[PDB]
């Protein structure tokens, strides 16, 4: 849990720390959409991304959300994106962030066909160190791991975002969006006590999706597996809870990788591999000590 070439740019982040001061709307000029926007700060030439969370809600509560949010200035590590400030303008709280040239791993997946195992090797260490950092350095679990909230850059870093700092902001947003791709753990759907074990399941499920190029529930029939190489919300969630978990195809992926996802996708969260059980696993100790130009893989596939 230390490296000097990432102690280099952690600190050069805290040098653009001083440049921001405080922030509100007119400082920012919109560039493009990515809901969140690409922004251009004016007192400080930094190019950021700005969240917009429309909330329609009391005096005292905002003050206590933004002060609950101020915990993100404190947390810093090479496996978590960069936080600048939080303010409220015009019925919409706005979190301004570090911007990411590459986008979410959902972004890159739909442009690529599938993502190779060697890269998701390195992706897996980024996630596991991130979650390990946040638990033992801040006593918080992510609560929402999915491909769209893992972001990558043309420099080569992988870090997580959109995790739960403020117990209230959870309570105050009025409506959630429920589609056909769920990453909630079976223990979280049943209303049982949960730990960072849930984030491990969410990681496992995202990995098999990225390795196959398709959301894996319900699993495909023999015809679509050959090719690759109408469902109601409730019965998808019920599939997650009662049918066996998805698994990678035995043919095209290494044993170390298959056993990795299989341990992340165990239903019983007690038998599921815990955070650092995963870091002595064969698959990532093999993957840690490999040379893959992540920056090069990215720029060639999305085109930048």
């Amino acid at each position: 849990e230390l490296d000097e070439q990432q102690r280099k740019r952690l600190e050069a982040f805290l040098t653009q720390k001083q440049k921001v001061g405080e922030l509100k709307d007119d400082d920012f000029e919109k560039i493009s959409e990515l809901v969140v926007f690409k922004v251009s700060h004016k007192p400080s030439g930094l190019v950021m991304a700005r969240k917009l969370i429309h909330l329609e809600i009391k005096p005292a509560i905002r003050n206590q959300i933004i002060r609950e949010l101020q915990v993100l200035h404190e947390c810093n590590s090479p496996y978590i994106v960069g936080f600048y400030g939080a303010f409220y303008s015009d019925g919409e709280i706005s979190i301004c962030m570090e911007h990411m040239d590459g986008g979410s791993l959902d972004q890159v997946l739909k442009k690529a066909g599938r993502i190779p195992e060697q890269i998701l090797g390195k992706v897996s260490i980024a996630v596991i160190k991130g979650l390990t950092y946040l638990r033992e350095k801040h006593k918080i679990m992510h609560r929402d791991v999915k491909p769209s909230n893992i972001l990558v850059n043309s420099r080569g870093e992988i870090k997580l975002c959109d995790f739960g700092v403020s117990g209230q902001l959870i309570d105050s947003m009025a409506n959630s969006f429920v589609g056909t791709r769920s990453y909630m753990s079976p223990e979280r759907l049943q209303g049982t006590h949960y730990s960072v074990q849930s984030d491990i399941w969410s990681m496992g499920l995202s990995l098999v999706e990225m390795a196959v190029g398709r959301y894996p529930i319900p699993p495909p029939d023999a015809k679509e597996l050959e090719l690759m190489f109408p469902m109601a919300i409730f019965e998808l969630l019920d599939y997650i809870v009662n049918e066996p978990p998805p698994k990678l195809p035995s043919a095209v992926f290494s044993l170390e990788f298959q056993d990795f996802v299989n341990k992340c996708l165990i239903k019983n969260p007690a038998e599921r591999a815990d955070l650092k059980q995963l870091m002595v696993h064969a698959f990532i100790k093999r993957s840690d000590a490999e040379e893959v130009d992540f920056a090069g893989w990215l720029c060639s596939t999305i085109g930048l």
Binding site: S176, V178, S182, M184, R188, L189, Q190, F234, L237
Partner: peptide, 10 residues
């Protein structure tokens, strides 16, 4: 959360 409510109530 919403998904937990859907499955629990279903």
């Amino acid at each position: 959360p919403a998904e937990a409510i859907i499955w629990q109530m279903g």
